[PDB]
């Protein structure tokens, strides 16, 4: 048979103090973040109605004192939160100062719940919140990170036009990032329905996972220092990673292109910058032009030569769409203008109706690579011999890696190295991440950048996007 199957191991993640482990949860609980925070204070401001603020304070007070696991069934799936003590997996503590806390009056919420027009009601709610946060920022009570805790009666009008995209677009002029929390997470008594008819209500996972995900996001947003990173091997050349995705305008059918840049820091650090430019559209097509790709590569090389005082040696570009001649010509022309000799161009396809089948009521392990005559089938979702079982039903779909014909490295090394780039994102802490962070970061940047008006400020800081 002309099929060569590989089972890559789980990639390691380098935490602080030269410790590496495959689990972000236990790894953070063991060694803490990679880039430590010089200090001990993360100040939090809360915006919402009165009851949301009291439940937010109660939530912080409860989760600061340890959280039990879900059960003894598959313990690695549900590890207990250790709280913000001396066993804290952040080496810092969060406090909610009383000098800045925005309580929303019931008259304004009543006026919000009375407007029949859908657009301007969400717009005025977003603008009022933004004005409260701006007056928060202008004073001497600046917080490190803000929390928008929403009530139930606001949520019937806001949810039942997006709210997160509008708020994160209109909050990009501030000096701190914000985080949105629904009513259901803070209070376990009440629970809301959704858009379709609902006799029942929504359901979320238990408070162990909520605390881990929410507070890892809060720590990265507040401190500004990255929790973990991909562990670099010894011997390889210097490299710079780019990812490309697409999105829509929410009113028309026109498609845009997003981007994200990564390179290793000169030392122990990582860079997840965005791009302070709003690439425009050239038609409703999932393919970009060649000049904008050239400008992307020049910006990437300028950032690398600014940080490292030298050019890189390798460039990795990940794309959701298939590479074409024009984009490859532009990237190659930019690179040989700069003078780099190692290139790798890979298209990721998420719609391939081929799978690896076996008997035993369970699918194959995560990290299964099959060479389909120059292509690559990768099982980034699958069975896990660390979580106990495979979390989920039916089968996990695989993704296909299609390299360009100008890429130097073979399909197996590229597949392993893309498999090492998946579990990097700091929004989550689980392992079942089927999308590499050059793709997911570009998707997040594009999702936030949907509602940003023309002639506005676009920040390259990643904390304004997740």
């Amino acid at each position: 048979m002309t099929f060569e199957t590989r089972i890559f191991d789980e990639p390691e993640l380098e935490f602080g103090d030269h410790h590496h482990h495959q689990d972000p949860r236990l790894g953070l609980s063991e060694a803490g973040p990679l880039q430590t925070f010089l200090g001990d204070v993360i100040k939090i401001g809360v915006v919402g109605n009165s009851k949301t603020i009291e439940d937010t304070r109660k939530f912080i007070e409860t989760v600061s004192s340890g959280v039990e696991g879900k059960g003894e069934k598959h313990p690695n799936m549900h590890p207990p939160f250790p709280g913000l003590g001396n066993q804290s997996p952040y080496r810092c503590r969060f406090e909610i100062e009383d000098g800045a806390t925005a309580a929303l009056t019931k008259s304004k919420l009543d006026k919000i719940g009375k407007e029949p027009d859908h657009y301007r009601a969400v717009e005025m709610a977003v603008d009022e919140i933004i004005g409260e946060l701006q007056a928060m920022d202008d004073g001497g009570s600046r917080p490190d990170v803000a929390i928008i805790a929403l009530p139930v009666k606001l949520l019937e009008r806001v949810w039942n036009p997006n709210f997160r995209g509008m708020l994160k677009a209109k909050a990009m002029g501030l000096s701190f990032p914000i985080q949105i929390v629904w009513e259901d997470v803070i209070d376990d008594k009440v629970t809301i329905p959704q858009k379709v008819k609902e006799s029942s209500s929504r359901k979320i996972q238990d408070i162990a996972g909520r605390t881990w995900n929410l507070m890892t996001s809060l720590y990265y947003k507040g401190s500004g220092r990255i929790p973990w990173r991909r562990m670099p091997l010894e011997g390889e050349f210097s490299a710079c990673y780019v990812g490309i995705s697409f999105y829509r305008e929410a009113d028309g059918q026109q498609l845009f292109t997003s981007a994200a840049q990564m390179f290793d820091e000169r030392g122990r650090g990582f860079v997840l910058k965005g791009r302070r430019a709003r690439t425009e559209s050239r038609g409703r097509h999932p393919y970009m032009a060649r000049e904008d790709a050239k400008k992307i590569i020049e910006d990437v090389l300028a950032a690398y030569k600014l940080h490292h005082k030298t050019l890189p040696a390798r460039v990795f570009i990940l794309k959701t769409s298939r590479f074409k001649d024009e984009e490859a010509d532009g990237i190659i022309a930019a690179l040989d203008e700069a003078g780099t000799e190692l290139r790798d161009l890979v298209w990721v396809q998420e719609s391939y109706t081929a799978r690896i089948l076996r008997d035993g009521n369970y699918p194959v392990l995560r990290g299964t690579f099959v060479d389909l005559h120059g292509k690559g089938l990768l099982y980034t979702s699958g069975s896990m011999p660390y979580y106990g079982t495979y979390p989920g039903k039916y089968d996990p779909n695989p993704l296909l890696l299609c390299p360009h014909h100008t890429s130097e490295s073979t399909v197996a090394q590229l597949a392993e190295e893309i498999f090492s780039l998946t579990k990097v994102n700091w929004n989550s802490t689980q392992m079942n991440q089927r999308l590499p962070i050059p793709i997911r970061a570009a998707r997040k940047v594009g999702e936030v950048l949907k509602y940003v008006g023309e002639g506005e400020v676009i920040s390259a800081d990643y904390r304004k996007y997740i």
Binding site: F3, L357, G360, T389, K393, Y394
Partner: protein, 389 residues
């Protein structure tokens, strides 16, 4: 609050130590890293010269990866380098407020750096009267894929004829001959697997322009529109040589079975080698209360997508379910039921389907081979889990 728990932990650990002697000083508030200096008592006289001890106290709560038998602790390399360069052995203890779990662990000073990842263990590692001198003497499975290698026949047929396909369909339904479904016309060219002139379908083709061409010439090329026409021809052929126990529905491209035996389920036993195909291929379900009203009679179908690899063509299988309420009418609502059944079935139902279909069902012009088999380097340890249905 956490500042007093360390002091009381140090005090009660010292009380345990002073319980059987073990002269402990503690430190002042000027200390950093190593805690106070302790010794070992010998029946009422300090025979031991000196040793170093460090306190580590935590609140109520289990440790990392603690499941009834052990736990794990990690050591900072600054502290490890601090203790490695020293002149005295050190010991490390743990918390005391759940059930007073005073444990001892010692790091050695042998050749070679690196001593972290203290993995503590069972009841042979505790401070008690059981043993006290022990730390005082320091003076695969091959799987398959869902592909089907397809062996082509010898010759196809080509022609030239310029009628619209809508008129040709209306010609072939209103006629008297067999309902042949092997004809694809695109670009003005008549294509078929059977010979047009040896058929009743010759009415929509010219008699003098029928030619026989080799299969392998058009199987491989650089053009992809001809590949799309080839795949449509293969779909028409697969519809043709199976339309006796099924039909066609454009939703999910399903060849769902036709129920003509007056609401009888079909087990469809095959038993190819030892014992298989004992699962119900077609199932019958009645309503909640009344048997006069039928809820849904269900059966599963599939849809084939054809492709090429190194000039060898392949077919895919995506089996879907299909719920018919009362018969040949399309279902009023099937998304929640299809979602629920897909939520219910594990991976073995797909395995049972690929071992029961397209080798032993509707395979008894195109010859269908065995699905390809691959070697997996690591077998999934399914025997260790709970097997939670």
């Amino acid at each position: 609050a956490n500042q007093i728990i360390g002091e009381i932990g140090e005090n009660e650990v010292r009380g345990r130590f002073l319980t059987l002697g073990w002269q402990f000083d503690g430190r002042s508030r000027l200390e950093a890293g190593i805690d106070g200096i302790a010794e070992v008592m010998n029946e009422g006289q300090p025979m031991a010269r000196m040793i170093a001890v460090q306190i580590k106290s935590t609140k109520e709560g289990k440790y990392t990866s603690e499941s009834d038998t052990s736990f794990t602790y990690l050591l900072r390399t600054q502290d490890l380098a601090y203790w490695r360069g020293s002149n005295l052995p050190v010991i490390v203890v743990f918390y005391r407020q759940s059930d007073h779990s005073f444990y001892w662990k010692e790091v050695s000073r042998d050749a070679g750096p690196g001593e972290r990842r203290l993995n503590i263990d069972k009841v042979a590692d505790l401070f008690n009267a059981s043993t006290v001198n022990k730390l005082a003497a320091l003076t695969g499975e091959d799987a398959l894929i869902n592909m089907l290698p397809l062996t082509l026949p010898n010759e196809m047929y080509i022609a030239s004829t310029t009628y619209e396909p809508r008129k040709a369909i209306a010609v072939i339904l209103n006629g008297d001959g067999p309902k042949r479904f092997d004809w694809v016309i695109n670009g003005g060219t008549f294509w078929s697997f059977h010979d047009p002139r040896t058929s009743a379908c010759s009415e929509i083709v010219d008699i003098d322009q029928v030619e026989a061409i080799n299969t392998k010439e058009l199987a491989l090329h650089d053009d992809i529109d001809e590949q799309n026409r080839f795949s449509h021809l293969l779909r028409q052929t697969l519809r043709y040589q199976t339309d006796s126990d099924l039909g066609w529905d454009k939703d999910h491209k399903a060849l769902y079975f036709r129920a003509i035996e007056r609401e009888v389920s079909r087990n469809f036993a095959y038993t190819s080698s030892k014992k298989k195909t004992d699962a119900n291929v077609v199932s019958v379900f009645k309503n909640s209360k009344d048997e006069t009203r039928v809820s849904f009679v269900r059966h599963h179908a599939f849809s084939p997508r054809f492709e090429l690899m190194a000039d060898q063509w392949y077919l895919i299988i995506t089996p879907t379910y299909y719920y018919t309420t009362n018969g040949y009418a399309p279902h009023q609502f099937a998304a929640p039921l299809l979602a629920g059944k897909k939520r219910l079935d594990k991976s073995a139902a797909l395995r049972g389907q690929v071992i029961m279909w397209h080798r032993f069902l509707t395979q008894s012009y195109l010859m269908f081979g065995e699905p390809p088999s691959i070697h997996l380097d690591v077998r999934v340890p399914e025997d260790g889990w709970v097997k939670e249905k």
